[PDB]
Coordinates of C-alpha atoms and ligand atoms in Angstrom, one line a residue:
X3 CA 31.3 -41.1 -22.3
X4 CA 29.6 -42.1 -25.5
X5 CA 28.1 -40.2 -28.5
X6 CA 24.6 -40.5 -28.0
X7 CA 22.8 -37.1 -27.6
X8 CA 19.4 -35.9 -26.5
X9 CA 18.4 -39.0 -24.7
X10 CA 16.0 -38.4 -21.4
X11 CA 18.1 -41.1 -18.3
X12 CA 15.4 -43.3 -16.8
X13 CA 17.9 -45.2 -15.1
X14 CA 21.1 -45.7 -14.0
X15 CA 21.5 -47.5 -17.2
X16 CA 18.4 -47.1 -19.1
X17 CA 18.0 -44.2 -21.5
X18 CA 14.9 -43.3 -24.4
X19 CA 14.5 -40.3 -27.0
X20 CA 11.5 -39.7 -29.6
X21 CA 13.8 -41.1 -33.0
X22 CA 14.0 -42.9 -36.0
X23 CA 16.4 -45.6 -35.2
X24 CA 17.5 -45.5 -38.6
X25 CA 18.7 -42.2 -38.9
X26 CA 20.2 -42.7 -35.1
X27 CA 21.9 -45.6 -36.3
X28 CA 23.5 -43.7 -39.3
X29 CA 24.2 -40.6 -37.2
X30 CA 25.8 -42.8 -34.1
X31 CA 27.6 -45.6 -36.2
X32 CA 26.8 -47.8 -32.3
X33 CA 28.8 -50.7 -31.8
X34 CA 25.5 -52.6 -31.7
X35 CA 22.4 -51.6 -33.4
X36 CA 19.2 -53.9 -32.0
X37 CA 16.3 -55.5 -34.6
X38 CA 13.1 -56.2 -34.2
X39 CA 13.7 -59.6 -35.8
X40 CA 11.7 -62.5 -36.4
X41 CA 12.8 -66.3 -36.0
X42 CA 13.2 -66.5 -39.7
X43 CA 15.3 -63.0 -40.5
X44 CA 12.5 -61.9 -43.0
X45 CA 13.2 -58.1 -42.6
X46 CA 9.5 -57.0 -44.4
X47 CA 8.5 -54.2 -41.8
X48 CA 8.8 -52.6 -39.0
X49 CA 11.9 -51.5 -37.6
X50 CA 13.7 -54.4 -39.4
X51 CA 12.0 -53.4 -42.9
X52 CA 13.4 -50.0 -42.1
X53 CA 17.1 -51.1 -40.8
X54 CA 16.9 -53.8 -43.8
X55 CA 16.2 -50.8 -46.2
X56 CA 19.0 -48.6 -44.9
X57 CA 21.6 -51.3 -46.1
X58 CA 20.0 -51.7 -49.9
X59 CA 19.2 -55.1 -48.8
X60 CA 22.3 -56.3 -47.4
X61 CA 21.0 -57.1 -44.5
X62 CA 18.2 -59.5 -45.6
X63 CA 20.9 -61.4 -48.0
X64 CA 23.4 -62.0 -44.9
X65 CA 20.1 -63.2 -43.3
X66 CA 19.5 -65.5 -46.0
X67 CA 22.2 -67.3 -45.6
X68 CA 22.4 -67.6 -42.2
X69 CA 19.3 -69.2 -41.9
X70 CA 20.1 -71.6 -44.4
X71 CA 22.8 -72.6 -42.1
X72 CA 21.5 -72.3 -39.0
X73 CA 17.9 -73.0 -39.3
X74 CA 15.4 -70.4 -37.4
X75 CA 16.1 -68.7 -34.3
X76 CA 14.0 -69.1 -31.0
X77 CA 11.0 -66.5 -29.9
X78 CA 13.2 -64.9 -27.0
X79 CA 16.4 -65.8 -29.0
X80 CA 18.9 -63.3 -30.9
X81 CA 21.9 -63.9 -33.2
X82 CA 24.7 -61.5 -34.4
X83 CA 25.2 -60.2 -37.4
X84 CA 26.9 -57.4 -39.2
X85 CA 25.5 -53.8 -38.8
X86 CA 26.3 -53.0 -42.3
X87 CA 26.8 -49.2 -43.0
X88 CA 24.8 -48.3 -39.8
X89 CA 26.8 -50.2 -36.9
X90 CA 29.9 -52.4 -36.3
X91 CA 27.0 -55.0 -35.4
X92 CA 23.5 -55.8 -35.5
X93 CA 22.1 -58.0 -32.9
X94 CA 18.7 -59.5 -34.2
X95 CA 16.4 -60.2 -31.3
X96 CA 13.2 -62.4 -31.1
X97 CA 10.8 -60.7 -29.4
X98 CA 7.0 -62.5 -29.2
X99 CA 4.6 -61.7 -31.9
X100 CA 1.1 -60.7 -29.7
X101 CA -0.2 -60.8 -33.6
X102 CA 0.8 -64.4 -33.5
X103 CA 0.1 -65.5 -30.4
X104 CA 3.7 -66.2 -28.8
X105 CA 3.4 -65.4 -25.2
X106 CA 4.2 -62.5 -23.9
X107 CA 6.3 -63.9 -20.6
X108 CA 9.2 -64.9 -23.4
X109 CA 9.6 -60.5 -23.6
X110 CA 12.0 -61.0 -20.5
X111 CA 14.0 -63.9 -22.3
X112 CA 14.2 -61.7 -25.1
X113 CA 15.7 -58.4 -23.1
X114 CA 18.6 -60.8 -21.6
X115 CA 19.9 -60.9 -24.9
X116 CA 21.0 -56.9 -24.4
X117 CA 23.0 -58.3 -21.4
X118 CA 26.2 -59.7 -23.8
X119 CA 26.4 -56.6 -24.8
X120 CA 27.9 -53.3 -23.0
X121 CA 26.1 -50.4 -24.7
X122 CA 23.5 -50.7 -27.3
X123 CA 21.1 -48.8 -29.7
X124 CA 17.9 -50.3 -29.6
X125 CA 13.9 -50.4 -29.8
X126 CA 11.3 -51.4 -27.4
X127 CA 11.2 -55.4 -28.4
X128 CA 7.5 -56.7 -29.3
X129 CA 6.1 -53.2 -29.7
X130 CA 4.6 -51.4 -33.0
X131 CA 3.9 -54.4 -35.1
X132 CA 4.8 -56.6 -33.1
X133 CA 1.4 -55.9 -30.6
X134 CA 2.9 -55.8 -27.0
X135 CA 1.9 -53.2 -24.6
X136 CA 5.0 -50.4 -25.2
X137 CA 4.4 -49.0 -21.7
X138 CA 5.0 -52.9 -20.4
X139 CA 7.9 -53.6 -23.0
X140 CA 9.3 -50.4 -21.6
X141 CA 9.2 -52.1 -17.9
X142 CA 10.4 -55.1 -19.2
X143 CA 13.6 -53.7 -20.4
X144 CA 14.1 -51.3 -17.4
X145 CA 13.7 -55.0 -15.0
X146 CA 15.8 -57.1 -16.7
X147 CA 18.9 -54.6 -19.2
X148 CA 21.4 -54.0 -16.4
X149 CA 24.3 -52.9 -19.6
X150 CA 23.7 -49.1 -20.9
X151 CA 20.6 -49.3 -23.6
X152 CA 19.7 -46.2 -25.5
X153 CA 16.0 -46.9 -26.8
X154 CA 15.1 -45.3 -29.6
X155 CA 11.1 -43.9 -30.0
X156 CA 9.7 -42.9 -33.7
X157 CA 6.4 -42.0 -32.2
X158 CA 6.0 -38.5 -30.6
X159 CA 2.3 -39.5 -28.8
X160 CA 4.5 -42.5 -27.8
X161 CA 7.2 -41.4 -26.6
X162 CA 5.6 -39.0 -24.6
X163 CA 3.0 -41.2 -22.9
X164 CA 6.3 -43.6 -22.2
X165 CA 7.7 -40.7 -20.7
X166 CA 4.7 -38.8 -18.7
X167 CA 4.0 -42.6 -17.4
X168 CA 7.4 -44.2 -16.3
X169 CA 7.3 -45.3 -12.7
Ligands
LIG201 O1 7.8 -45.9 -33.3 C1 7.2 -47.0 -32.9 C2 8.3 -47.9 -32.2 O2 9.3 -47.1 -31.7 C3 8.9 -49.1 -33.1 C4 7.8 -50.2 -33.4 C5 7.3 -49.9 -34.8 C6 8.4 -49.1 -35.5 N1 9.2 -48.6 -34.5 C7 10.4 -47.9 -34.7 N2 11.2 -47.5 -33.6 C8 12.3 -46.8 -33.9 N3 12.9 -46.5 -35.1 C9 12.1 -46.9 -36.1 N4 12.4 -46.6 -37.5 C10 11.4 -47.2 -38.3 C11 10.5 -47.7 -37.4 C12 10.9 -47.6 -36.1
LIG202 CL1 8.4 -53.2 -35.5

């Protein structure tokens, strides 16, 4: 039993609600919080401009410097980090950039990451600004997440076409 509440169960392990991860994040406190991250931690918009917000900037400056130790991360790669005032931890996740041209097939790398971890708060990875196919990022994550993910939605029109089209 966890404290995640309202979420519709796709799954045995899969689970998605119309919500602002932000304030999910705030009201949950998860052990792991999931960003839409890029290879170089810039946290400008999005779901990590948001997250990044939420922690007054914390989050970017942690980023900073752990890119100027480690160097990037990989498209389909993730690193942990602290979750700030929002989780215990935040695990920034590469998804590929449609907007960039990364290729799509890296999505599925991208959802093993969720697999180090038991439960987890998270988005859909390379939707919204990102320029994936929700519906297919959805389907991703259902195929390859076998630990408990709660996805968080903003979008209502969203949301509800995930829902009214889930297979
Ligand atoms: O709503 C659309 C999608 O869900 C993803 C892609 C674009 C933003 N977004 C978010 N998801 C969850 N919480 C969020 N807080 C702020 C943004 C956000
Ligand atoms: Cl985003």
């Amino acid at each position: 039993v966890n404290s995640f509440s309202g979420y519709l169960k796709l799954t045995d392990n899969v689970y998605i609600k119309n919500a602002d991860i932000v304030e999910e994040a705030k009201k949950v406190k998860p052990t792991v919080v999931v960003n839409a991250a890029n290879v170089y931690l810039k946290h400008g918009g999005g779901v990590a401009g948001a997250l990044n917000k939420a922690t007054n900037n914390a989050m970017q400056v942690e980023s900073d410097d752990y890119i100027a130790t480690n160097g990037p991360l990989k498209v389909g790669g993730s690193c942990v980090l602290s979750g700030h005032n929002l989780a215990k931890h935040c695990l920034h996740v590469v998804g590929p950039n449609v907007n960039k041209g990364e290729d799509i097939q890296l999505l599925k790398s991208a959802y093993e990451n969720f697999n180090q971890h038991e439960v987890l708060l998270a988005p859909l990875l390379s939707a919204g600004i990102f320029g994936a196919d929700p519906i297919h990022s959805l389907r991703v994550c259902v195929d390859t997440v076998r630990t408990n993910v709660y996805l968080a939605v903003f979008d209502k029109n969203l949301y509800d076409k995930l829902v009214s089209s889930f297979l």
